[PDB]
């Protein structure tokens, strides 16, 4: 009913952040969303990031209205320590293989 914001700093590993991203202002989501947190990646080991979280900002760069490609460029260009500001909607983010 009320969602919640957090800011966390993730130190990258060999595989980077360890996540995949979907969405963008150019999409049905209208936001940059974390689709998956990969096992054994940096974001998993940190424990705090969840699929479905929205990336609002990265190291002082606003991604609230970014297109998918704008966001990837931003994320690609980040340093070793990535300060992410996230919004967690109460909605679940569901993913099923069949
Ligand atoms: Na966003």
Curated annotation (Swiss-Prot):
Organism in which the protein naturally occurs: Homo sapiens (Human)
Written domain comment of the UniProt record: The PDZ domain 1 binds NG2. The PDZ domains 7 and 10 bind the Ad9 E4-ORF1 oncoprotein. The PDZ domain 9 binds F11R. The PDZ domain 10 binds the C-terminus of CLDN1 and KIT and the C-terminal PDZ-binding motif of HTR2C. The PDZ domain 13 binds CXADR. The PDZ domain 2 binds CAMK2A and CAMK2B. The PDZ domains 10 and 13 bind PLEKHA1 and PLEKHA2. The PDZ domain 13 binds SYNGAP1.
Quaternary structure, from the entry: Interacts with CLDN5, DLG4, GRIN1, F11R/JAM, CLDN1, NG2, CRB1, MPP4 and PALS1. Interacts with HTR2A, HTR2B, HTR2C, PLEKHA1/TAPP1, PLEKHA2/TAPP2, CXADR, SYNGAP1, CAMK2A and CAMK2B. Interacts with FAT4 (via cytoplasmic domain). Interacts with DLL1.
Name of the protein in question: Multiple PDZ domain protein
Domain PDZ, first and last residues per copy: 7-90
Compartments in which it is found: Cell membrane; Apical cell membrane; Postsynaptic density; Cell projection, Dendrite
Cystine connections: none
Tissue: Expressed in heart, brain, placenta, liver, skeletal muscle, kidney and pancreas.
Disease linkage: Hydrocephalus, congenital, 2, with or without brain or eye anomalies: A form of congenital hydrocephalus, a disease characterized by onset in utero of enlarged ventricles due to accumulation of ventricular cerebrospinal fluid. HYC2 affected individuals have variable neurologic impairment. Some individuals have other brain abnormalities, including lissencephaly, thinning of the corpus callosum, and neuronal heterotopia. Most patients have delayed motor development and some have delayed intellectual development and/or seizures.
Role of this protein: Member of the NMDAR signaling complex that may play a role in control of AMPAR potentiation and synaptic plasticity in excitatory synapses. Promotes clustering of HT2RC at the cell surface.
Signal peptide: none
